[PDB]
PDB file of C-alpha atoms (C1' of nucleotides) in Angstrom:
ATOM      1  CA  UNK A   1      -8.396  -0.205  -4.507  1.00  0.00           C
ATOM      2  CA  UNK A   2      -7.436   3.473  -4.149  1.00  0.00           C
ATOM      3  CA  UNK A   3      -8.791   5.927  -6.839  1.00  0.00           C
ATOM      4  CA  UNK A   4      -6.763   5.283 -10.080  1.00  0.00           C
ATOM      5  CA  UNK A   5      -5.873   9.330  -9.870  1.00  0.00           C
ATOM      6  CA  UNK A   6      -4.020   8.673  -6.853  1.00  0.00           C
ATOM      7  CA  UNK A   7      -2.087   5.731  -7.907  1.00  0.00           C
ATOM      8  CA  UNK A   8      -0.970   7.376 -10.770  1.00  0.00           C
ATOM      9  CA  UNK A   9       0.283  10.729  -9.424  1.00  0.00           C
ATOM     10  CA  UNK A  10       2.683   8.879  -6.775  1.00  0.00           C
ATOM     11  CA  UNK A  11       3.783   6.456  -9.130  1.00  0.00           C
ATOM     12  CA  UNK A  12       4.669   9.272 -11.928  1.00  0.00           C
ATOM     13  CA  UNK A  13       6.347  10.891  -8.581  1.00  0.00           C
ATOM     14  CA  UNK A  14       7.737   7.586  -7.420  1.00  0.00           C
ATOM     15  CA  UNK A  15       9.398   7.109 -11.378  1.00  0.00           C
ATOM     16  CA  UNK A  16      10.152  10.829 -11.501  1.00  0.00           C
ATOM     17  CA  UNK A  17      12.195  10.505  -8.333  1.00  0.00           C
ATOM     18  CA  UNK A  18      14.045   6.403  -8.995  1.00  0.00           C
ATOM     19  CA  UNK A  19      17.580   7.223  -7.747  1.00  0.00           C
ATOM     20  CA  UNK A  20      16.147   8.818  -4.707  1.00  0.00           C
ATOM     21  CA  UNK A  21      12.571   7.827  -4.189  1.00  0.00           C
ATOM     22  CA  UNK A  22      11.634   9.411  -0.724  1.00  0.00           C
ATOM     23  CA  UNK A  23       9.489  12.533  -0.946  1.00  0.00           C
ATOM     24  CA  UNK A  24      10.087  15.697   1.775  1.00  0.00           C
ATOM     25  CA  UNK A  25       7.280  15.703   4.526  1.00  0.00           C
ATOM     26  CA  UNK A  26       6.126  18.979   2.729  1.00  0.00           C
ATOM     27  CA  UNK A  27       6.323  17.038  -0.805  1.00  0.00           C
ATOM     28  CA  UNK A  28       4.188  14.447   1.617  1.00  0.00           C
ATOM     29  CA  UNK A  29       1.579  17.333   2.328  1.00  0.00           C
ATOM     30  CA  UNK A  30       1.634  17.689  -1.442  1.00  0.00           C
ATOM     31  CA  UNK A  31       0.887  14.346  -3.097  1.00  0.00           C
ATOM     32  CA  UNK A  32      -1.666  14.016  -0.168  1.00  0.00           C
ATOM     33  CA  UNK A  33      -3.381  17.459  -1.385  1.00  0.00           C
ATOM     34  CA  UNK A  34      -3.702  16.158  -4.849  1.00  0.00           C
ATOM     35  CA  UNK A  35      -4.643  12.661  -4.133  1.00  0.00           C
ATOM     36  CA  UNK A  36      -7.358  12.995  -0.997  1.00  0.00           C
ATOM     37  CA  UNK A  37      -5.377  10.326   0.717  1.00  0.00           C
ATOM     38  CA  UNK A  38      -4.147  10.828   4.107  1.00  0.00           C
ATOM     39  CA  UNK A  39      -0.691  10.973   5.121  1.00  0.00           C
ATOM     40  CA  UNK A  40      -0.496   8.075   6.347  1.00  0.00           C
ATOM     41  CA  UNK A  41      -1.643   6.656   3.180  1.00  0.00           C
ATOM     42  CA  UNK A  42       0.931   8.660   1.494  1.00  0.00           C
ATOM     43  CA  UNK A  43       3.379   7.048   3.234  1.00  0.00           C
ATOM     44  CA  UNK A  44       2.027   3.555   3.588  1.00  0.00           C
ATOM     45  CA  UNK A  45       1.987   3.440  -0.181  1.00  0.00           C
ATOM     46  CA  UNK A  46       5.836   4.774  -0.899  1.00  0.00           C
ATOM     47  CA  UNK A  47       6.956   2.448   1.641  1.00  0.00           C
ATOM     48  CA  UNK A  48       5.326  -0.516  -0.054  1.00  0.00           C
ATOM     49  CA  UNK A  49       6.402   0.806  -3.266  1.00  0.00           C
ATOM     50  CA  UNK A  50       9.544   1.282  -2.755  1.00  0.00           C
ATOM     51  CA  UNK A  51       9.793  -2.837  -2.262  1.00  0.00           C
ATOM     52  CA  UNK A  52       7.424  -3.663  -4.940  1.00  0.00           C
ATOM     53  CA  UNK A  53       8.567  -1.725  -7.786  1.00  0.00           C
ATOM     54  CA  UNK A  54      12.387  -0.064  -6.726  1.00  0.00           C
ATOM     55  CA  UNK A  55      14.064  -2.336  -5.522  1.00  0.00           C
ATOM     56  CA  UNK A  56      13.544  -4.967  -8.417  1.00  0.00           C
ATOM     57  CA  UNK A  57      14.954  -2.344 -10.923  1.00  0.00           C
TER      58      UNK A  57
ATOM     59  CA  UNK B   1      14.892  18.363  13.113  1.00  0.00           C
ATOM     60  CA  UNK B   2      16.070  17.690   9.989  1.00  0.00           C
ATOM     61  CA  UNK B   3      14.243  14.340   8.384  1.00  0.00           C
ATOM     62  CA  UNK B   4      17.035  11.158   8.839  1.00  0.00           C
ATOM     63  CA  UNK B   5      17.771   9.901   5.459  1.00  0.00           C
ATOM     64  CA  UNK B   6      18.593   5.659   4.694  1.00  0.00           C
ATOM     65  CA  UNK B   7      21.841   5.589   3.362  1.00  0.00           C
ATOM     66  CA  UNK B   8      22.701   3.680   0.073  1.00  0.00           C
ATOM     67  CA  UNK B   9      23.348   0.030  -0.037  1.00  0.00           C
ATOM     68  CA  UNK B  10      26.490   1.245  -1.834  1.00  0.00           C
ATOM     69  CA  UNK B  11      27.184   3.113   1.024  1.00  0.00           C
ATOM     70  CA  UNK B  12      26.394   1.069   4.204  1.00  0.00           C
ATOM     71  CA  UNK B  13      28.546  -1.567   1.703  1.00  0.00           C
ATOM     72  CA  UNK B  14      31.318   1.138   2.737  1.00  0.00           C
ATOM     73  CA  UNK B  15      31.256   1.592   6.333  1.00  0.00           C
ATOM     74  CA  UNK B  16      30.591  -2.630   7.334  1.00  0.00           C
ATOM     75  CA  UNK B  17      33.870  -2.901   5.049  1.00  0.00           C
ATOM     76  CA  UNK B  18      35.464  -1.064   7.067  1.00  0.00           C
ATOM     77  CA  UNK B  19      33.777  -1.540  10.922  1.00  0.00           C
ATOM     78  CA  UNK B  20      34.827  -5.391  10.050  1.00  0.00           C
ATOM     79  CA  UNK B  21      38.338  -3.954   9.837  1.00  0.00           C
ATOM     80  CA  UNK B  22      37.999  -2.375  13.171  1.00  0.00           C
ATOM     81  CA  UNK B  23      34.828  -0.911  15.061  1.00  0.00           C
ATOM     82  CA  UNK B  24      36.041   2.410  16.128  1.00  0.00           C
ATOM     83  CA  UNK B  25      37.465   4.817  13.328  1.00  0.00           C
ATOM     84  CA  UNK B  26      40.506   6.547  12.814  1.00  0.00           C
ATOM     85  CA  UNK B  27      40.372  10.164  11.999  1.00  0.00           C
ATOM     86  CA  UNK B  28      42.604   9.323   8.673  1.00  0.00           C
ATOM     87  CA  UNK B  29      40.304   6.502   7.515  1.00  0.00           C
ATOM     88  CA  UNK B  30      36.767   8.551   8.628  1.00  0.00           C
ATOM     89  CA  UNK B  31      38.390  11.094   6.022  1.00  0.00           C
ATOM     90  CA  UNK B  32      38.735   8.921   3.360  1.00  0.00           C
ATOM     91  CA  UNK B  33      35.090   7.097   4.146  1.00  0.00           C
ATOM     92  CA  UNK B  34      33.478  10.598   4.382  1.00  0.00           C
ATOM     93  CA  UNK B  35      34.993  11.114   0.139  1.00  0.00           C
ATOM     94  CA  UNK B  36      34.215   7.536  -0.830  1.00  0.00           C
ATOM     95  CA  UNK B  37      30.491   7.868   0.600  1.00  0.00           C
ATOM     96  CA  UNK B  38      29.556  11.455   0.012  1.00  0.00           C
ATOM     97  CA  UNK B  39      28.806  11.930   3.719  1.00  0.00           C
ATOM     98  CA  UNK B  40      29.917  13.912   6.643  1.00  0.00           C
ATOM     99  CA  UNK B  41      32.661  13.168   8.904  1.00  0.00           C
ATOM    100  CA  UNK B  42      29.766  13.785  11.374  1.00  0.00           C
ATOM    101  CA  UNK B  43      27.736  11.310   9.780  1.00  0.00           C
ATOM    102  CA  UNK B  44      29.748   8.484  10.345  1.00  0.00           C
ATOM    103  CA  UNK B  45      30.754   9.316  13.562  1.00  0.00           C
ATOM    104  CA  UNK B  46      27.637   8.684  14.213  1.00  0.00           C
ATOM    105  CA  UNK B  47      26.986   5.769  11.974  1.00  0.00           C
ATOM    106  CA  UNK B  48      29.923   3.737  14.048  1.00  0.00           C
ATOM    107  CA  UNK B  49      28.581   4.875  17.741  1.00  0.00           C
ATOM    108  CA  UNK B  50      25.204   3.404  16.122  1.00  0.00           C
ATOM    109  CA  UNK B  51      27.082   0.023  14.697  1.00  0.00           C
ATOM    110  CA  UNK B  52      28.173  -0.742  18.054  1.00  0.00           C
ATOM    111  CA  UNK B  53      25.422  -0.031  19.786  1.00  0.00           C
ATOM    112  CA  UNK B  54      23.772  -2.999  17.291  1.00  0.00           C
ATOM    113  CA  UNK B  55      26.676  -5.170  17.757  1.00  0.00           C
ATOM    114  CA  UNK B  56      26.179  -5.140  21.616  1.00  0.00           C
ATOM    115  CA  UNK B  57      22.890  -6.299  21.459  1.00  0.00           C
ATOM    116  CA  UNK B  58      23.802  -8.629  19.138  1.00  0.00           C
ATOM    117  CA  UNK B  59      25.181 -10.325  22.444  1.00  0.00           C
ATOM    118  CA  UNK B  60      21.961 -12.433  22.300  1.00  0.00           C
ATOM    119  CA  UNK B  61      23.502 -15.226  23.487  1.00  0.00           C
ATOM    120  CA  UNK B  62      20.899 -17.443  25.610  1.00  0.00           C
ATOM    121  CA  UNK B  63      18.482 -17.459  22.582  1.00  0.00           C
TER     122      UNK B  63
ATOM    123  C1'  DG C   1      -1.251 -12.248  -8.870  1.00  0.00           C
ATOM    124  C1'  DT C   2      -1.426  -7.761  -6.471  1.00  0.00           C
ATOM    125  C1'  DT C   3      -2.367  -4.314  -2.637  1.00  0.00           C
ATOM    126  C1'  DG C   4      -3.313  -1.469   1.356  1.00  0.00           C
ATOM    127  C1'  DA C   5      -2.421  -1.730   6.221  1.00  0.00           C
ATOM    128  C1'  DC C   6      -0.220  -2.269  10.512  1.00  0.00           C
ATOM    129  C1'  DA C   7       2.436  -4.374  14.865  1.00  0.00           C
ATOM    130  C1'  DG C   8       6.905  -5.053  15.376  1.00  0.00           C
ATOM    131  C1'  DT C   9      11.547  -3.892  14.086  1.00  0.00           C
ATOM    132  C1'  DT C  10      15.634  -1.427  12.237  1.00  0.00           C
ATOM    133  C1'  DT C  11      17.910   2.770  10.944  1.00  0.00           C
ATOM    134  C1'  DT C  12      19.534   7.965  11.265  1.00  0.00           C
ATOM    135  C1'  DA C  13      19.997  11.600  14.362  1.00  0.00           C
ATOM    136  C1'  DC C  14      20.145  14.354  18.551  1.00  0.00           C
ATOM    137  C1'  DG C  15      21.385  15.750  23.452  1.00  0.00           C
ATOM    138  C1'  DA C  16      22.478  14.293  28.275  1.00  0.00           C
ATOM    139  C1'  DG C  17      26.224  13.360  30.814  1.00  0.00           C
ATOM    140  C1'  DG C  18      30.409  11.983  31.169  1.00  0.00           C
TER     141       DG C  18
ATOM    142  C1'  DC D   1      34.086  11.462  21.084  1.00  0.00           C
ATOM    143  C1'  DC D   2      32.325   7.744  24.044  1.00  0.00           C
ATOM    144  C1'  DT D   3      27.885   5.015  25.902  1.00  0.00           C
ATOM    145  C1'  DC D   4      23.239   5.949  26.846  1.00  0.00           C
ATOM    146  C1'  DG D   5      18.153   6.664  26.143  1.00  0.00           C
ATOM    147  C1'  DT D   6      15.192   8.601  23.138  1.00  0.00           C
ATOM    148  C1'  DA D   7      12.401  10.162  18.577  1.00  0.00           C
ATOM    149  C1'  DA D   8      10.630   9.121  14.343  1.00  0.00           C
ATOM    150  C1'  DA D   9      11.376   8.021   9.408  1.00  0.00           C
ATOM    151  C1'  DA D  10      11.658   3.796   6.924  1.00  0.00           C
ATOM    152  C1'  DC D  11      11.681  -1.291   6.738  1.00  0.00           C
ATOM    153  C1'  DT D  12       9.863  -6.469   7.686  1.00  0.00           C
ATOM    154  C1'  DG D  13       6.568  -9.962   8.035  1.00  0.00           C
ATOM    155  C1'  DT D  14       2.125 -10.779   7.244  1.00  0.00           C
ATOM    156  C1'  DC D  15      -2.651 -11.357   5.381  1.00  0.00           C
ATOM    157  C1'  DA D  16      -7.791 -10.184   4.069  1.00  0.00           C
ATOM    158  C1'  DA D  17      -9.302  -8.369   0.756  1.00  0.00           C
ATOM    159  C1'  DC D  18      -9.113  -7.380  -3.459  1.00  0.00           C
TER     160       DC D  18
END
DNA sequence: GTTGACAGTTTTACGAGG
DNA sequence: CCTCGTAAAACTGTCAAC
């Protein structure tokens, strides 16, 4: 598991953002800061999310 | 550069409408595509050069 | 029952060169 | 504006490790 602070950051971005849900490579830099994942991570985890939790709704 | 960005499924809906019709577009109809979609006449340009270029290797065919 | 990761693929976006 | 090769952001299929 990730730290449960840096799930819940990108998902209240991820929910913040529905009708477009892809951050800006500085918004990347961002939610990276605040979480201590990489970038990478970052965008491993919107890129899974966006099939496991947009795309149903 | 500036990022790419996925187009809606509303919008790629759009365009395959109308490549089906016929894979190079007029200037009348890339008019009308560019209001219906929101995006740039330069966009979907673009977008159709692309289409083809999947469509041609789509010519697979011994497989 | 989910989840983070990644090799392989598809999708926007440009310039080269015509 | 076309076909082309290229990049690189985002997606697909997949699976051990939760």
């Amino acid at each position: 598991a990730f730290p449960k602070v840096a799930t819940n950051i990108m998902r209240a971005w991820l929910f913040q953002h529905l009708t477009h849900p892809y951050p800006s490579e500085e918004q990347k830099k961002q939610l990276a800061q605040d979480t201590g994942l990489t970038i990478l991570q970052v965008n491993n985890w919107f890129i899974n999310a966006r099939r496991r939790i947009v795309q149903p709704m | 550069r500036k990022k790419r960005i996925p187009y809606s499924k509303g919008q790629l809906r759009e365009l395959e409408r109308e490549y089906a019709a016929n894979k190079f577009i007029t200037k009348d109809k890339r008019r009308k595509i560019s209001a219906a979609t929101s995006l740039s006449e330069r966009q979907i340009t673009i977008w159709f050069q692309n289409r083809r270029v999947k469509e041609k290797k789509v010519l697979a065919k011994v497989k």
